Design a protein around this ligand. Structure first.
Ligand SMILES: NC(=O)Cc1c[nH]c2ccc(Cl)cc12
Ligand SMILES: NC(=O)Cc1c[nH]c2ccc(Cl)cc12
Length: 330
């Protein structure tokens, strides 16, 4: 009658063996700080959910990044804070230094460790083949850690990867979309950016898991190695599935729909058509060849799969020979 259920292949039950307070974020009490510890120095950007500022901690002149939240429901803020606290200190995770509240306007504001420069405008531009491997391996460290801590990031894309190319350091940021994985739980599919949503989000399969972040990572890698950003350039959510299908083929699409007994929105019944699975060589040209290799295409093929169950996990991804040179170098 309904969709066939699903469980993560790894880290399935790590949140069950935790004390309830670790993932029951609705019950978390926020420990506020004094916002008068801090002065804003200048603005750095503004995303969909917050404005971002360079700022200074006046007691100990420490330099800091301040994210002033546009108003969201109290429970999503408790979620983000709890996740950031759980992950603090893990590899390549942004560190949450404080959390403050404007006395007048009552707006919450997270305070983070300084890092500078973003993946955009330096992504498909200045990085060598070895850079891409190195930085991808650093992202995998973050994803494997957070998954092993029971947490889905759900918004992996270049805008949320802060790289500081001088010091070869990387932080995975904006955890406001992240969730705890619980076996059997049905999640909201209206997450992540259009170009990075996995097939499970596009077909509205709610019992997804960590492997969602591995579809996004595969999207990021495809755009970097082919120098085509975004790789899947959908007009909207329904067309986004069409763009994937024109690359991955429809056969595996309808195979995935049947294995999980997914009801396909009748909207799709006309735009998907029939498409062969294309070979990756179709995307290689003179301008991107120096970043493409058999290793990279093989690795990519194993991230971009319809069946979320069959994607490389993060730990498996780090064992792929695309990263042999990186691993030996540390
Ligand atoms: N002393 C202040 O209240 C300055 C200020 C205005 N708006 C903010 C938002 C966050 C943080 Cl940490 C500081 C500020
Ligand atoms: N949220 C952003 O993408 C804006 C931004 C620019 N530069 C940063 C550095 C650190 C952090 Cl947390 C955020 C930013």
């Amino acid at each position: 009658s309904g969709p066939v259920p699903s469980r993560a292949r790894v880290y399935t039950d790590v949140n069950t063996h935790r004390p309830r307070e670790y993932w029951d974020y609705e019950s978390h009490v926020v420990e506020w700080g004094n916002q008068d510890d801090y002065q804003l120095v200048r603005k750095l950007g503004r995303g969909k959910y917050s404005e971002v500022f360079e700022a200074i901690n006046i007691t100990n002149n420490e330099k800091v990044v301040v994210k002033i939240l546009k108003p969201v429901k109290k429970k999503k803020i408790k979620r983000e804070i709890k996740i950031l606290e759980n992950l603090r200190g893990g590899p390549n995770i942004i560190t949450l230094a404080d959390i403050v509240k404007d006395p007048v306007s009552r707006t919450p504001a997270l305070v983070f460790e300084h890092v500078n420069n973003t993946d955009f405008k330096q992504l498909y531009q200045t990085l060598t083949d070895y850079d891409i491997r190195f930085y991808m391996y650093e992202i995998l460290k973050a994803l494997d850690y957070c998954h092993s801590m029971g947490i889905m990031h759900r918004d992996v894309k270049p805008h949320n990867v802060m790289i500081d190319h001088e010091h070869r350091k990387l932080r995975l940021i904006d955890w406001g979309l992240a969730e705890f994985y619980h076996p059997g739980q049905e999640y909201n599919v209206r997450v992540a950016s259009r170009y990075f949503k996995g097939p499970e989000l596009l077909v509205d399969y709610q019992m997804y898991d960590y492997s969602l972040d591995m579809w996004s990572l595969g999207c990021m890698l495809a755009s970097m190695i082919f120098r085509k950003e975004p790789f899947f350039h959908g007009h909207d959510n329904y067309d986004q599935l069409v763009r994937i299908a024109k690359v991955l083929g429809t056969e595996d699409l309808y195979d995935y729909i049947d294995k999980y007994n997914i009801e396909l929105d009748p909207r799709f019944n006309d735009i998907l058509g029939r498409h062969s699975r294309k070979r990756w060589e179709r995307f290689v040209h003179s301008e991107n060849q120096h970043l493409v290799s058999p290793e990279a295409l093989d690795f990519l093929d194993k991230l971009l799969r319809y069946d979320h169950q069959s994607r490389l996990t993060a730990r498996e991804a780090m064992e792929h020979p695309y990263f042999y040179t990186v691993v030996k170098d540390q």
